[PDB]
């Protein structure tokens, strides 16, 4: 199909595998810009001009897993490990609420020390502040996810990473795509707003894999989708692999918006890392959420999922005002409420 025919089918919501594979395989600049324009317009029509701010506190870099791409993998001995205390986490969350954050995201390595009861206590304290709480702690038993929901957690971010089960198992040797999906379905059944999403440009990943990632996200109708390029980390087995391509990752964001028009889609930190200004571009091609770093020094510099992570050298209250300025220079508006998904039911 020509690029014009693909766009026509995308505008008519004819989301066949062939259409998605062709959209990802055409590299014509005119096609790409029309695709970005379509996703930008779909975003504006369904989710409006508000860009929702989710303040992230990366509260521990301890991890029991050994994912091949991740700088926090347990075999990396070239890393100072840290754990914030529950009081530090709660008071850091309070400072973010004082700065205007309406969602607090708690993210960590899979660190058993807090699980499940310390997390529940922290969540209860933060919920007293009248904000949304999102957890991103990895794979844990249903009993833990249930305790955290009863403590008040609203959302859970568990990126599916890759929908190809063979690749998933080789990159995440402790677990499987089957377990990852089971976790996501459990999270949805418990009432969380649930976030999935993948990396783009993983070693061995093909365009057919990316199409499957899109169809996976569409199949389960996730409330949030977090997408970013793979960035190789020197202290991992993938150190010598190529980084993911920014334009291809941006096309995945755009297609995700076109497929899931009312979903919440961040312009991820990784997008800001591989290309200067990458998050701002992504907010104009389908994304509607930004997640400023609210981890305090001296820990912020130690949460090294991939190298070059932006925000590391800024003062540690800098990132919320920075994204507020970003939203204004983009001609967008701050989110007024918690920014939960607002479903538009269609046909």
Ligand X SMILES: C[C@H]1O[C@@H](n2cnc3c(N)ncnc32)[C@H](O)[C@@H]1O
Q: Which residues are annotated as a binding site?
A: 63, 67, 70, 311, 319, 322
Contact between 32 and ligand CPS (CB under 6 A)?
Answer: yes
In the region spanning residues 292 to 311, those forming contacts with ligand X, defined by CB under 6 A, are: 305-306
Distance of CA 213 to the CA centre of its chain: 14
DSSP 234-267: TTSTTTTSPPPPHHHHHHHHHHHHHHSTTSB-B-
Q: How far apart are CA 328 and CA 290, in angstroms?
A: 13
Contact between 158 and ligand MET (CB under 6 A)?
Answer: yes
- Binding positions for [2Fe-2S] cluster are 311, 319, 322
- Residue 304 and residue 328 in contact, taking contact as beta carbons nearer than 8 Å: no
Name 106's bridge partners: 57, 135
Contact between 201 and ligand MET (CB under 6 A)?
Answer: no
Candidates 62, 68, 118, 318: give the one binding ligand [S] (CB under 6 A). Answer: 318
Candidates 51, 70, 225, 327: give the one binding ligand X (CB under 6 A). Answer: 70
Nearest alpha-carbon partner for 111 in 140, 91, 133: 140
Strands, E assignment, 75-204 = 103-108, 132-136, 155-157, 193-196, 199-200
- Binding positions for [4Fe-4S] cluster are 63, 67, 70
Residue nearest to ligand CYN (CB): 291
| Residue 282 contact partner, candidates ligand [S], Fe ion, ligand CYN, none, CB within 5 to 8 A by sort of partner | none
Q: Which is nearer to ligand X, 269 or 332 (CB)?
A: 269
Candidates 68, 79, 310, 324: give the one binding ligand FES (CB under 6 A). Answer: 310
Residue nearest to ligand CPS (CB): 284
Neighbours of 304 (CB within 10 A): 21
Q: Is 138 left (phi over 0), alpha (psi -120 to 50) or beta?
A: left
Q: Which is nearer to ligand CYN, 115 or 291 (CB)?
A: 291
In the region spanning residues 63 to 92, those forming contacts with ligand SF4, defined by CB under 6 A, are: 63, 65, 67, 70, 72-73
- Residue 122 and residue 90 in contact, taking contact as beta carbons nearer than 8 Å: yes
Q: How far apart are CA 175 and CA 266, in angstroms?
A: 26
Residue ranges in contact with ligand X by CB under 6 A = 69-70, 159, 161, 199, 228, 230-231, 233, 270, 305-306
Residue ranges in contact with ligand CPS by CB under 6 A = 29, 32-33, 36-37, 40, 98-100, 246-247, 250, 275, 281, 284-285, 321, 324-325, 328, 334
């Amino acid at each position: 199909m020509t690029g014009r025919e693909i766009l026509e089918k995308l505008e008519r919501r004819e989301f066949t595998r062939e259409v998605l594979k062709e959209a990802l395989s055409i590299n014509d600049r005119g096609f790409n810009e029309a695709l970005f324009k379509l996703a930008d317009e779909i975003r504006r029509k369904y989710v409006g001009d508000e860009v929702h701010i989710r303040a992230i506190i990366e509260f521990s870099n301890v991890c029991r897993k050994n994912c091949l791409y991740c700088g926090l993998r347990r075999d990396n001995k070239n890393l100072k490990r840290y754990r914030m205390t529950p009081e530090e986490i709660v008071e850091r969350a309070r400072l973010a609420v004082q700065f205007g954050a309406k969602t607090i995201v708690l993210q960590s390595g899979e660190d058993p020390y807090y699980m499940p009861d310390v997390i529940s206590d922290i969540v209860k304290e933060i919920k007293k502040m009248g904000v949304a709480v999102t957890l991103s702690l990895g794979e844990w038993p249903r009993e833990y996810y249930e305790k955290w929901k009863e403590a008040g957690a609203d959302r859970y971010l568990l990126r599916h990473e890759t929908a190809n089960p063979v690749l998933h198992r080789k990159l995440r040797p402790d677990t499987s795509f089957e377990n990852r999906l089971n976790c996501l379905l459990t999270l949805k059944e418990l009432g969380y707003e649930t976030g999935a999403g993948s990396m783009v440009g993983l070693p061995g990943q093909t365009i057919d894999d990316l199409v499957d990632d899109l169809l996976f996200l569409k199949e389960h109708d996730f409330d949030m989708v977090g997408i970013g390029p793979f960035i190789p980390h020197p202290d991992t087995p993938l150190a010598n692999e190529k980084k993911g391509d920014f334009t291809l990752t941006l096309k995945m964001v755009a297609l995700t918006r076109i497929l899931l028009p009312d979903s919440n889609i961040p312009a991820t930190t990784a997008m800001g890392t591989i290309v200067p200004g990458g998050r701002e571009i992504t907010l104009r091609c389908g994304a509607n959420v930004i997640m400023p770093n609210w981890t305090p020094s001296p820990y912020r510099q130690l949460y090294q999922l991939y190298p070059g992570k932006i925000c590391v050298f800024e003062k540690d209250t800098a990132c919320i005002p920075c994204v507020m300025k970003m939203i204004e220079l983009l001609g967008r508006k701050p989110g007024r409420d918690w920014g939960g998904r607002k479903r538009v039911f269609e046909t």
